[PDB]
Amino acid sequence: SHMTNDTSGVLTIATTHTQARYSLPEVIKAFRELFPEVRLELIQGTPQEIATLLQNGEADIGIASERLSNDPQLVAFPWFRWHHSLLVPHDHPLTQISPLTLESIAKWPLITYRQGITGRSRIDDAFARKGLLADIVLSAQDSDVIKTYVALGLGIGLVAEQSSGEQEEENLIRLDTRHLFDANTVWLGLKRGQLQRNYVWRFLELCNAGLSVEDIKRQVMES
Amino acid sequence: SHMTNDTSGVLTIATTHTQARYSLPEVIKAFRELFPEVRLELIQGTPQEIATLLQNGEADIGIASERLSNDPQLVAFPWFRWHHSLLVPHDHPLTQISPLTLESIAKWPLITYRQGITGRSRIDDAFARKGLLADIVLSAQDSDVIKTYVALGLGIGLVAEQSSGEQEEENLIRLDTRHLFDANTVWLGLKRGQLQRNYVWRFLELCNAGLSVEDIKRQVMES
Q: What total of structural domains would you count in chain A?
A: 2
Q: In what order do the strands lie in the sheet with B9-15?
A: A172-176, A84-89, A156-160, A110-113, A136-140, B38-44, B9-15, B61-64, B184-191, B74-82
Of A42, A137, A169, which has the smallest distance from its Cβ to B41's Cβ? A137
A17 and B CB contact within 8 Å: yes
The answer to whether B42 contacts A142, with C-beta atoms less than 8 Å apart, is no
A70 with A31, same domain?
yes
A164 and B CB contact within 8 Å: no
In degrees, to the nearest 5, what angle opens at C-alpha A156 toward C-alphas A154 and A157? Answer: 110
B137 and A CB contact within 8 Å: yes
What's the CA gap between A186 and A79, in Å, rounded?
A: 5
Dihedral sign from CA coordinates of B183, B207, B116, A113: positive
Query: Which of A187, A182, A14 lies closest to A84 in space, CA to CA?
Result: A182
Backbone angles phi, psi at A215, to 5 degrees: -70, -45
What's the CA gap between B156 and B108, in Å, rounded?
A: 7
The number of beta carbons lying within 10 Å of the beta carbon of residue A75 is 23
A133 with A175, same domain?
yes
Torsion-angle region of residue B23: left (phi > 0), alpha (psi -120 to 50) or beta?
Answer: alpha
Let me know if A69 is exposed, middle or buried by CB neighbors in 10 A (0-12, 13-18, 19+).
Answer: middle
Residue A72 C-alpha, separation from nearest chain B C-alpha, in angstroms = 27
A106 with A142, same domain?
yes
What's the CA gap between A116 and A51, in Å, rounded?
A: 13
Residue B8 C-alpha, separation from nearest chain A C-alpha, in angstroms = 15
A20 and B CB contact within 8 Å: yes
Q: What is the resolution of this structure in A?
A: 2.8
What's the CA gap between B78 and B8, in Å, rounded?
A: 27
- Contact, B62 vs B33, CB < 8 A? no
What's the CA gap between A92 and A108, in Å, rounded?
A: 11
**Experiment type:** X-ray
Torsion-angle region of residue B37: left (phi > 0), alpha (psi -120 to 50) or beta?
Answer: alpha
Residue in A with minimal Cα distance to B142: A17
- Contact, A108 vs A150, CB < 8 A? no
B104 with B176, same domain?
yes
Q: How do strand B9-15 and strand B38-44 relate by DSSP bridges?
A: parallel
CA dihedral A95, A97, A99, A105 (to 10 degrees): -80
B74 with B88, same domain?
no
A15 with A102, same domain?
no
Dihedral sign from CA coordinates of B40, B41, B47, B52: negative
B173 with B100, same domain?
yes
Q: How far apart are the first and last CA of chain A?
A: 36
What's the CA gap between B223 and B211, in Å, rounded?
A: 19
Instruction: List Cβ neighbours of B96 (8 Å cut-off, separation of 6 or more).
Output: none
CATH number at residue B103: 3.40.190.10
B157 with B88, same domain?
yes
- Contact, A79 vs A50, CB < 8 A? no
DSSP classification of residue A205: H
Instruction: Tally the residues of chain B.
Output: 223
DSSP classification of residue A182: -
Of A17, A25, A137, which has the smallest distance from its Cβ to B141's Cβ? A17
B36 with B20, same domain?
yes
B30 and A CB contact within 8 Å: no
Instruction: List Cβ neighbours of A50 (8 Å cut-off, separation of 6 or more).
Output: A14, A15, A16, A59, A62, A63, A64, A67, A68, A189
What's the CA gap between A22 and B84, in Å, rounded?
A: 25
Of A40, A45, A141, which has the smallest distance from its Cβ to B45's Cβ? A141
The answer to whether B139 contacts A21, with C-beta atoms less than 8 Å apart, is no
A73 with A100, same domain?
no
B44 with B131, same domain?
no
B196 with B174, same domain?
no
* Residue range of the domain that includes B128: 83-183
- Contact, A47 vs A121, CB < 8 A? no
Torsion-angle region of residue A204: left (phi > 0), alpha (psi -120 to 50) or beta?
Answer: alpha
Q: What sections of chain B are H helices per DSSP?
A: 17-22, 24-34, 47-56, 93-96, 102-105, 120-129, 143-152, 198-207, 213-221
**Chain B contact probe: residue of A16, A52, A141, A150 with most B CBs at under 10 A:** A141
Query: Which of A97, A104, A68 lies closest to A189 in space, CA to CA?
Result: A68
A140 to chain B: which residues are within 8 Å by CB?
20, 44
A47 and B CB contact within 8 Å: no
DSSP states of A28-92: HHHHHHH-TTEEEEEEE--HHHHHHHHHHTS-SEEEESSSSTT-TTEEEEEEEEE-EEEEEETT-
A139 to chain B: which residues are within 8 Å by CB?
42-44
The alpha carbon of A75 is separated from its chain's Cα centroid by a whole number of angstroms, namely 17
